[PDB]
Curated annotation (Swiss-Prot):
Organism: Escherichia coli (strain K12)
UniProt similarity note: Belongs to the Dus family. DusC subfamily.
The protein's name in its UniProt record: tRNA-dihydrouridine(16) synthase
Result of knocking out the encoding gene: A dusA dusB dusC triple mutant exhibits a complete lack of 5,6-dihydrouridine modification in cellular tRNA, whereas each single mutant exhibits a partial reduction, compared to wild type.
Cofactor: FMN
Miscellaneous comment text of the record: DusB and DusC together account for about half of the 5,6-dihydrouridine modification observed in wild-type cellular tRNA, and DusA accounts for the other half. These three enzymes seem to act site-specifically on the tRNA D-loop and contain nonredundant catalytic functions in vivo.
Amino acid sequence: MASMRVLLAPMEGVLDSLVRELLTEVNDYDLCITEFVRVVDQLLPVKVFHRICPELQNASRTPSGTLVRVQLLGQFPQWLAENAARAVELGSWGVDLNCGCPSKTVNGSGGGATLLKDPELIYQGAKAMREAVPAHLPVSVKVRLGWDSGEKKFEIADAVQQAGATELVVHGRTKEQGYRAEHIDWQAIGDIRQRLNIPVIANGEIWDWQSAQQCMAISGCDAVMIGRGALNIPNLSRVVKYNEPRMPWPEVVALLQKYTRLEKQGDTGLYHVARIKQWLSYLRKEYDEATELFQHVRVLNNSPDIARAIQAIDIEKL
Ligand SMILES: Cc1cc2nc3c(=O)[nH]c(=O)nc-3n(C[C@H](O)[C@H](O)[C@H](O)COP(=O)(O)O)c2cc1C
């Protein structure tokens, strides 16, 4: 009965430092990846890295102690390398490169999924980052299987290994397959793993204990990355590693109350409401109780009204 790694996926516009703080304290995530820093042709200021990844000031860990890694998105090897170096100087435990997400091409620099059309770009990006990060810290890369087909999936994988990356996360879909459940190919993740000599972390459609078991049995990976599921089920790392039942509704309400108490405390803004609405939108998929709450919360505009709504729910009488 085997060791296993579970990583918390990066999620631009959904997961920030505060949500990472809350989730990690009720989970056993081995690592969270931050939402990406967009790299074009410039070294980004220290403020940008600290505000995206406050954990850099706590030895690259959430307050409960979970490691966090800074992600980059961009194409130009010079600048990835220089931003990679800055993330590490500031204390990031290694650095990740995003080759999975659809992304605008700004100033001739593409990024994310658009690199999947030309694996040589991934090789050059990742290799410059590997050369600029001290050799003992890791450099990871996240990929999809290709742009509009999986034909280049092994070329993408090789590019990452040959650049000297430490590990590879495979979102087992193409870019054009988006998030459609019917297209996840965990078997291709496995075919990739077999060919490589670095750890492959399986990603996509991992919702619960059984799905994770199924995914690992097919891919052969002893590591997985959970994204949307980590919001659907707040203790999903424990569900997946130990077959814990899903967090019961009264404990998730307690968690959201805490969200709103830290919301105000951190001074995160008078109209900082999107992530709390989004979280509830995800929680409808697993908890019938969250549909009523989401309705009452979605029509609200500001963080104070939303807090009173949520921290007025009596956890006992429930
Ligand atoms: C709203 C949203 C934002 C995302 N932002 C990022 C991101 O910043 N960087 C990244 O590498 N992946 C990002 N992803 C992709 C996830 O990391 C993950 O690969 C994807 O959701 C598949 O995992 P799942 O089926 O567990 O959710 C995002 C996904 C969603 C839905």
